[PDB]
Amino acid sequence: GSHMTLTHTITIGDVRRELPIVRVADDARIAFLKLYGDVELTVACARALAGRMPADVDVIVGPETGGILLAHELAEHSGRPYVIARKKLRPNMVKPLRVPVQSIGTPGQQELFLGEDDAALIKGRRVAVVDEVISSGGTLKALHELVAAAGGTVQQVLTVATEGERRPDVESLLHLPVYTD
Ligand SMILES: Nc1ncnc2c1ncn2[C@]1(CO)O[C@H](COP(=O)(O)O)[C@@H](O)[C@H]1O
Ligand SMILES: [Ca+2]
Protein backbone atom coordinates (compact mmCIF):
# COMPACT_ATOMS: atom_id res chain seq x y z
CA GLY A 1 0.00 0.00 0.00
CA SER A 2 2.76 2.42 -0.96
CA HIS A 3 4.89 3.42 -3.92
CA MET A 4 8.42 2.27 -4.76
CA THR A 5 11.43 4.31 -3.71
CA LEU A 6 14.08 2.12 -5.34
CA THR A 7 17.43 3.63 -6.33
CA HIS A 8 20.46 2.84 -8.50
CA THR A 9 23.86 3.73 -7.04
CA ILE A 10 26.45 5.60 -9.10
CA THR A 11 29.91 6.77 -8.11
CA ILE A 12 31.84 9.41 -10.08
CA GLY A 13 35.25 9.42 -8.48
CA ASP A 14 34.14 9.61 -4.87
CA VAL A 15 30.87 11.43 -5.50
CA ARG A 16 28.18 8.86 -4.65
CA ARG A 17 24.54 9.29 -5.68
CA GLU A 18 21.36 7.18 -5.44
CA LEU A 19 19.40 7.68 -8.63
CA PRO A 20 15.63 7.24 -8.24
CA ILE A 21 14.21 4.48 -10.42
CA VAL A 22 11.14 6.09 -11.96
CA ARG A 23 8.49 4.99 -14.42
CA VAL A 24 8.69 6.43 -17.94
CA ALA A 25 6.51 4.06 -20.01
CA ASP A 26 3.91 1.30 -19.69
CA ASP A 27 6.67 -1.24 -19.15
CA ALA A 28 9.83 0.67 -18.20
CA ARG A 29 11.60 2.50 -15.39
CA ILE A 30 14.94 4.33 -15.59
CA ALA A 31 17.48 5.45 -12.99
CA PHE A 32 17.00 9.18 -13.35
CA LEU A 33 20.14 11.36 -13.46
CA LYS A 34 19.60 14.90 -12.11
CA LEU A 35 22.47 17.34 -12.74
CA TYR A 36 20.22 20.34 -11.96
CA GLY A 37 20.78 21.42 -8.37
CA ASP A 38 23.93 19.31 -7.88
CA VAL A 39 27.16 21.29 -8.32
CA GLU A 40 29.29 18.49 -6.85
CA LEU A 41 27.95 15.84 -9.27
CA THR A 42 28.04 18.22 -12.24
CA VAL A 43 31.64 19.25 -11.63
CA ALA A 44 32.74 15.66 -10.96
CA CYS A 45 31.14 14.40 -14.20
CA ALA A 46 32.66 17.25 -16.24
CA ARG A 47 36.09 16.66 -14.69
CA ALA A 48 35.97 12.92 -15.43
CA LEU A 49 34.87 13.53 -19.01
CA ALA A 50 37.52 16.23 -19.58
CA GLY A 51 40.12 13.66 -18.52
CA ARG A 52 39.00 11.66 -21.58
CA MET A 53 38.83 14.52 -24.09
CA PRO A 54 41.97 14.49 -26.29
CA ALA A 55 43.98 17.55 -27.24
CA ASP A 56 42.71 17.22 -30.84
CA VAL A 57 39.24 18.49 -29.86
CA ASP A 58 38.67 22.11 -30.92
CA VAL A 59 35.10 22.78 -29.74
CA ILE A 60 32.41 21.28 -27.48
CA VAL A 61 28.79 21.04 -28.67
CA GLY A 62 25.85 20.10 -26.46
CA PRO A 63 22.08 20.24 -26.71
CA GLU A 64 19.57 22.35 -24.75
CA THR A 65 18.98 21.28 -22.01
CA GLY A 66 20.97 18.06 -21.35
CA GLY A 67 24.29 19.47 -22.44
CA ILE A 68 24.16 22.93 -20.87
CA LEU A 69 25.80 22.28 -17.49
CA LEU A 70 28.21 19.66 -18.82
CA ALA A 71 29.37 21.67 -21.83
CA HIS A 72 29.85 24.77 -19.66
CA GLU A 73 31.94 22.89 -17.06
CA LEU A 74 33.89 20.96 -19.72
CA ALA A 75 34.71 24.26 -21.41
CA GLU A 76 35.65 25.87 -18.10
CA HIS A 77 37.93 22.95 -17.22
CA SER A 78 39.57 22.48 -20.62
CA GLY A 79 39.70 26.01 -22.04
CA ARG A 80 37.93 24.92 -25.23
CA PRO A 81 35.02 26.98 -26.58
CA TYR A 82 31.55 25.46 -26.57
CA VAL A 83 28.23 25.81 -28.37
CA ILE A 84 24.71 24.94 -27.28
CA ALA A 85 22.25 23.70 -29.91
CA ARG A 86 18.93 25.25 -28.93
CA LYS A 87 15.48 23.61 -28.86
CA LYS A 88 13.67 26.83 -29.90
CA LEU A 89 14.25 29.62 -32.37
CA ARG A 90 15.54 32.76 -30.64
CA PRO A 91 15.68 36.30 -32.11
CA ASN A 92 19.52 36.38 -32.20
CA MET A 93 19.42 33.44 -34.64
CA VAL A 94 19.86 34.50 -38.25
CA LYS A 95 19.70 31.87 -41.00
CA PRO A 96 19.45 28.96 -38.54
CA LEU A 97 20.37 25.39 -39.29
CA ARG A 98 17.64 23.03 -38.07
CA VAL A 99 17.33 19.26 -37.64
CA PRO A 100 14.51 17.05 -36.39
CA VAL A 101 15.20 14.91 -33.33
CA GLN A 102 13.97 11.34 -33.65
CA SER A 103 11.91 10.55 -30.56
CA ILE A 104 9.54 7.73 -29.64
CA GLY A 105 7.54 9.58 -26.99
CA THR A 106 6.32 12.27 -29.38
CA PRO A 107 7.68 12.42 -32.95
CA GLY A 108 7.95 15.32 -35.39
CA GLN A 109 7.94 18.10 -32.81
CA GLN A 110 11.49 17.84 -31.44
CA GLU A 111 14.11 20.04 -33.12
CA LEU A 112 17.63 21.37 -32.58
CA PHE A 113 18.90 24.66 -34.06
CA LEU A 114 22.20 26.44 -34.72
CA GLY A 115 22.32 30.15 -35.43
CA GLU A 116 24.78 31.21 -38.07
CA ASP A 117 27.12 32.46 -35.34
CA ASP A 118 27.10 29.05 -33.60
CA ALA A 119 27.60 27.43 -37.00
CA ALA A 120 30.49 29.75 -37.87
CA LEU A 121 32.08 28.58 -34.62
CA ILE A 122 31.73 24.92 -35.62
CA LYS A 123 32.70 25.06 -39.34
CA GLY A 124 36.01 23.31 -39.96
CA ARG A 125 36.67 22.18 -36.38
CA ARG A 126 37.00 18.90 -34.53
CA VAL A 127 33.95 18.63 -32.24
CA ALA A 128 33.31 16.79 -29.00
CA VAL A 129 29.54 16.23 -28.70
CA VAL A 130 28.32 16.03 -25.07
CA ASP A 131 24.96 15.19 -23.49
CA GLU A 132 24.03 13.98 -20.03
CA VAL A 133 22.58 10.59 -21.06
CA ILE A 134 22.35 8.69 -24.35
CA SER A 135 19.29 6.45 -24.46
CA SER A 136 17.75 5.87 -27.92
CA GLY A 137 20.44 7.99 -29.57
CA GLY A 138 18.00 10.25 -31.39
CA THR A 139 19.42 13.36 -29.74
CA LEU A 140 22.96 12.21 -30.57
CA LYS A 141 22.11 11.53 -34.22
CA ALA A 142 20.49 14.99 -34.52
CA LEU A 143 23.66 16.55 -33.09
CA HIS A 144 25.78 14.60 -35.57
CA GLU A 145 23.59 15.95 -38.36
CA LEU A 146 23.78 19.54 -37.09
CA VAL A 147 27.56 19.38 -36.71
CA ALA A 148 27.88 17.94 -40.23
CA ALA A 149 25.54 20.60 -41.64
CA ALA A 150 27.68 23.31 -40.03
CA GLY A 151 30.93 22.00 -41.54
CA GLY A 152 32.50 20.37 -38.49
CA THR A 153 33.57 16.82 -37.73
CA VAL A 154 32.47 14.87 -34.66
CA GLN A 155 35.69 13.50 -33.20
CA GLN A 156 34.33 12.29 -29.86
CA VAL A 157 31.03 11.74 -28.04
CA LEU A 158 30.99 12.39 -24.30
CA THR A 159 28.18 11.45 -21.92
CA VAL A 160 27.66 10.67 -18.26
CA ALA A 161 25.76 7.50 -19.12
CA THR A 162 24.67 5.27 -21.91
CA GLU A 163 21.29 3.71 -21.22
CA GLY A 164 19.69 0.60 -22.64
CA GLU A 165 22.10 -0.31 -25.43
CA ARG A 166 25.80 -0.14 -24.63
CA ARG A 167 27.76 2.08 -27.01
CA PRO A 168 31.47 1.32 -27.51
CA ASP A 169 31.92 4.27 -29.91
CA VAL A 170 30.91 6.57 -27.03
CA GLU A 171 33.01 7.87 -24.15
CA SER A 172 30.73 7.35 -21.16
CA LEU A 173 31.26 7.36 -17.41
CA LEU A 174 28.90 4.41 -16.77
CA HIS A 175 26.05 2.35 -18.20
CA LEU A 176 22.51 2.53 -16.85
CA PRO A 177 20.29 -0.53 -17.30
CA VAL A 178 16.66 -0.07 -18.19
CA TYR A 179 14.32 -1.62 -15.60
CA THR A 180 10.82 -3.10 -15.88
CA ASP A 181 7.80 -1.08 -14.73
N1 LIG B 1 18.20 8.15 -16.91
C2 LIG B 1 18.08 9.40 -17.37
N3 LIG B 1 18.28 10.44 -16.54
C4 LIG B 1 18.16 11.68 -17.02
N5 LIG B 1 17.88 12.08 -18.26
C6 LIG B 1 17.70 11.03 -19.07
C7 LIG B 1 17.77 9.70 -18.71
N8 LIG B 1 17.52 8.89 -19.81
C9 LIG B 1 17.30 9.73 -20.80
N10 LIG B 1 17.40 11.04 -20.40
C11 LIG B 1 17.22 12.20 -21.27
C12 LIG B 1 15.93 12.90 -20.89
O13 LIG B 1 14.85 11.98 -20.93
O14 LIG B 1 17.14 11.68 -22.62
C15 LIG B 1 17.98 12.45 -23.51
C16 LIG B 1 18.50 11.58 -24.64
O17 LIG B 1 17.44 10.77 -25.20
P18 LIG B 1 17.70 9.97 -26.59
O19 LIG B 1 19.11 9.42 -26.57
O20 LIG B 1 16.65 8.87 -26.61
O21 LIG B 1 17.51 10.99 -27.71
C22 LIG B 1 19.08 13.05 -22.63
O23 LIG B 1 19.50 14.30 -23.17
C24 LIG B 1 18.41 13.18 -21.26
O25 LIG B 1 17.94 14.50 -21.07
CA1 LIG C 1 32.26 26.32 -12.71
Q: Is 164 in the pocket of ligand 1 (CB under 6 A)?
A: no
Measured in Å, residue 5 CA sits from the centre of ligand 2 at 32
Q: Classify burial at 26, counting beta carbons within 10 Å of its beta carbon; exposed 0-12, middle 13-18, buried 19 or more.
A: exposed
Method: X-ray
Q: Classify burial at 159, counting beta carbons within 10 Å of its beta carbon; exposed 0-12, middle 13-18, buried 19 or more.
A: buried
Measured in Å, residue 133 CA sits from the centre of ligand 1 at 5
Q: Is 32 in the pocket of ligand 1 (CB under 6 A)?
A: yes
Q: Report angle CA 41, 43, 45 to the nearest 5 degrees.
A: 65
Distance from C-alpha of 159 to C-alpha of 157, rounded to nearest angstrom: 7
101 Cβ neighbours under 8 A, 6+ residues apart: 110, 111, 112, 138, 139, 142
Distance from C-alpha of 112 to C-alpha of 99, rounded to nearest angstrom: 5
Resolution in A: 2.0
